[PDB]
C-alpha cells in the first residue's frame, strides 16, 4: 500500500505559501516550504479539514 493511501496511517495536513494543501504521512519529515496546520490525525479527518478549509484551488500569489 502506498503510504498516502494507508487508511490506518497517521497523517498531517500541510500548507505552502500559495495556500495549497497537502496530506502528509506523519512519519515523514515535512518538506521545506510547507507548514503543518492539522494533525497528527486519521486520513479521513485530514481530508475533512482540507475540504472545509481549502476553498479555492488557485495559488494565492
Amino acid at each position: 500500500t502506498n503510504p498516502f493511501d494507508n487508511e490506518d496511517g497517521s497523517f498531517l495536513v500541510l500548507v505552502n505559501g500559495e495556500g495549497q494543501h497537502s496530506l502528509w504521512p506523519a512519519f515523514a519529515e515535512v518538506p521545506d516550504g510547507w507548514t503543518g496546520v492539522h494533525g497528527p490525525a486519521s486520513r479521513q479527518d485530514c481530508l475533512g479539514y482540507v475540504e472545509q478549509n481549502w476553498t479555492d484551488l488557485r495559488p494565492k500569489s
Binding site: 503510504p3 497537502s22 502528509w24 515535512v30 475533512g48 484551488l57
Partner: protein, 380 residues
C-alpha cells in the same frame, strides 16, 4: 506565460503564414487571430467574464480552433465535450464544471443540455486577455473527474523547446479535443509557427495517414492502439514523416522496431503522462537510424520537469529498484475542480523542491543507471 502570448509572437513574426488547414478552408495566423477576436467579442457580449467555464461541443474543424482561442481571449476556460458522448455524461460535465454556456454548431445544437445557453458558432472584436494563473481548461478523466489546468501549465507544455516543431511543419489533427493529445496537435504547431491540418471525418487509418503525408503532413500522433496496429500491419505507412508520436496504453518495443526497420529516417517519440500533468511528463525519442532494443522506456522528464521514484517511506530508491513514480516541476494542474480533498491526497508536497507539489501517478517505475525511466506497471 500563456499559449495566447506565445501565439501572438508568431502572428507578429509571420502573419501571412498558414495556421490552420481544414479541407479547402485555409486560415493564416492573422486570420485566425482576427476570427478569434471577433468571437471573443461575441462571448464577452453574451456575458462571458474572466474565469468562467465555457463548454465546447463541436466537430473538429477550423471553427473548433477559433472557438478555443476565442474562449481564452475572453479570459475564460474551455470545457471540451466530445460530440459523441451520451447526454447524461454531457450534462454532468457541464454542471460539475460550472459552465452556464456552451459553444456549438448547427449540427451539434441538439446536444446542448437544457438550461444551458447555446452559442452557435455559425452566427465587435474585444479581448480581456489570458493570464498565466487563470484556468485554461477543465478536462475530464471510474468516476469522471475534472482536471483544472492553468494557462501557465499549458504554455509550459506547448512551448517546450524539446518538441522541435518548426514553421515548415504540418501536424495532423484528429485526436478528440476532449483529450490531452490535442494540446500537441493544436497548440504546439501554433506556438511554433507551423500549421494544423484537420483530418477528414472518421478514424485515421494507415491509408489516410499515407494520404496526409503526401499532402504535406510532417508530424502525427497516434494512440498506442492505433500505432501498434499500423506498426504491425503497414509500418511503411509512416514513411515521409519527420516524426511519429505515440503513448497512452502500452507500446511494445517490437512495434517501434517494426517502424524503424521500415522507415529508417523517421523520428519515433514515446510519450508518458497523466492528464493531471498536462499531456506528458517524460518522453523517449528514437533518433533516425537508432534501434530500440528489448524495452521501450517511458524515458526522461521533459525539459523543466522532474520525476522521482520513491519507496514506501518516501525515500528515493537507487537505479534498478522499482518504486512509486511522482511527477513534478512544470505542467501540474491546479487540481480537481470542486474536490480539494482529492487534490490534497494526489498533488502532494515535494520533498525535493521548496514549497512545491508533485503528482502521485499511481504507477510503478525504475530508473536506469543513466537516468531514464522504465515503466513497471500500475501499482494496483
Amino acid at each position: 506565460s500563456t499559449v495566447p502570448e506565445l501565439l501572438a509572437r508568431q502572428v507578429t513574426r509571420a502573419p501571412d503564414a498558414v495556421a490552420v488547414v481544414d479541407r479547402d478552408r485555409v486560415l493564416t495566423y492573422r486570420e485566425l487571430d482576427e476570427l478569434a477576436g471577433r468571437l471573443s467579442g461575441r462571448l464577452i457580449g453574451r456575458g462571458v467574464r474572466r474565469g468562467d467555464r465555457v463548454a465546447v461541443l463541436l466537430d473538429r474543424s477550423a471553427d473548433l480552433v477559433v472557438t478555443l482561442l476565442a474562449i481564452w481571449k475572453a479570459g475564460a476556460a474551455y470545457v471540451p465535450v466530445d460530440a459523441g458522448y451520451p447526454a447524461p455524461r454531457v450534462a454532468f460535465m457541464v454542471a460539475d464544471s460550472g459552465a452556464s454556456r456552451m459553444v456549438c454548431s448547427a449540427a451539434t445544437r441538439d446536444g446542448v443540455p437544457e438550461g444551458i445557453e447555446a452559442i452557435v458558432v455559425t452566427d465587435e472584436a474585444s479581448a480581456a486577455g489570458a493570464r498565466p494563473g487563470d484556468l485554461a481548461y477543465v478536462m475530464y478523466t471510474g468516476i469522471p473527474k475534472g482536471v483544472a489546468v492553468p494557462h501557465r501549465s499549458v504554455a509550459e507544455l506547448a512551448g517546450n523547446p524539446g518538441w522541435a516543431v518548426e514553421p515548415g511543419d504540418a501536424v495532423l489533427m484528429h485526436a478528440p479535443y476532449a483529450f490531452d493529445a490535442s494540446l500537441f496537435e493544436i497548440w504546439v504547431p501554433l506556438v511554433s509557427g507551423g500549421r494544423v491540418v484537420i483530418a477528414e471525418p472518421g478514424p485515421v487509418d494507415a491509408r489516410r495517414l499515407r494520404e496526409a503525408i503526401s499532402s504535406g503532413v510532417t508530424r502525427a500522433h497516434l494512440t498506442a492502439g492505433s500505432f501498434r496496429a499500423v506498426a504491425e500491419e503497414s509500418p511503411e505507412s509512416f514513411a515521409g514523416l519527420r516524426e511519429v508520436l505515440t503513448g497512452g496504453d502500452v507500446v511494445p518495443a517490437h512495434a517501434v522496431a517494426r517502424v524503424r526497420s521500415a522507415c529508417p529516417r523517421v523520428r519515433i517519440r514515446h510519450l508518458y503522462g497523466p492528464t493531471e500533468t498536462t499531456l506528458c511528463a517524460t518522453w523517449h525519442l528514437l533518433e533516425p537510424g537508432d534501434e530500440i532494443g528489448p524495452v521501450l522506456p517511458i524515458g526522461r522528464p521533459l525539459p523543466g520537469r522532474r520525476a522521482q521514484v520513491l519507496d514506501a517511506s518516501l525515500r528515493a530508491v537507487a537505479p534498478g529498484v522499482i518504486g512509486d513514480l511522482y511527477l513534478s516541476g512544470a505542467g501540474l494542474a491546479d487540481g480537481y475542480l470542486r474536490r480539494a480533498g482529492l487534490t490534497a491526497e494526489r498533488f502532494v508536497a515535494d520533498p525535493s523542491a521548496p514549497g512545491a507539489r508533485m503528482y502521485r501517478t499511481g504507477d510503478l517505475a525504475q530508473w536506469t543507471a543513466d537516468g531514464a525511466l522504465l515503466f513497471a506497471g500500475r501499482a494496483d
